[PDB]
Amino acid sequence: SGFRKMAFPSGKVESCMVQVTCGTTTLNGLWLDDVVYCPRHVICTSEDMLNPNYEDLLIRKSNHNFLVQAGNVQLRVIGHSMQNCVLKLKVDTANPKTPKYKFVRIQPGQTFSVLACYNGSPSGVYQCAMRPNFTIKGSFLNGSCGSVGFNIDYDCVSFCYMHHMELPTGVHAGTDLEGNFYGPFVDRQTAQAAGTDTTITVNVLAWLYAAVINGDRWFLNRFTTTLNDFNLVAMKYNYEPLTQDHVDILGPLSAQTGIAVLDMCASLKELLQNGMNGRTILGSALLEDEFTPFDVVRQCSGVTFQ
Our finding on whether 191 is near ligand 4WI (CB under 6 A) is: yes
Tell me the C-alpha distance between 41 and 53, whole Å: 10
**What's the min distance (Å) between Cβ of 103 and ligand 4WI?**
20
**Three-class SS of residue 241?**
coil
Of 164, 49, 179, nearest in space to 114 by CA: 164
289 touches ligand 4WI (CB under 6 A): no
Q: Which residue is nearest to ligand 4WI (CB)?
A: 145
Q: Which is nearer to ligand 4WI, 65 or 93 (CB)?
A: 65
Q: How many residues does the chain have?
A: 306
The entry of its own copies, ligand 4WI, none near residue 15 (CB within 5 to 8 angstroms by kind) is: its own copies
| Cβ contacts of 156 within 8 Å, gap of 6 or more | 99, 100, 101, 102
As measured in angstroms, the least distance from the Cβ of 200 to its own copies is 15
Cα-based distances in Å from 173 to 40, 167, 194, 216, 245: 14, 7, 9, 35, 27
From residue 277, how far is each of 5, 153, 199, 271, 272 by CA, in Å?
Answer: 24, 39, 20, 9, 11
Residues engaged in binding its own copies (CB under 8 A) = 1-12, 14-15, 115-119, 121-126, 128, 137-144, 166, 170-172, 214-215, 280, 283-286, 298-306
> Is residue 143 at the binding interface for ligand 4WI, with CB under 6 A as the rule?
yes
To ligand 4WI, the closest distance from the beta carbon of 215 in angstroms equals: 13
Residues that bind ligand 4WI (CB under 6 A): 1, 27, 41, 44, 49, 140-145, 164-167, 172, 187-192
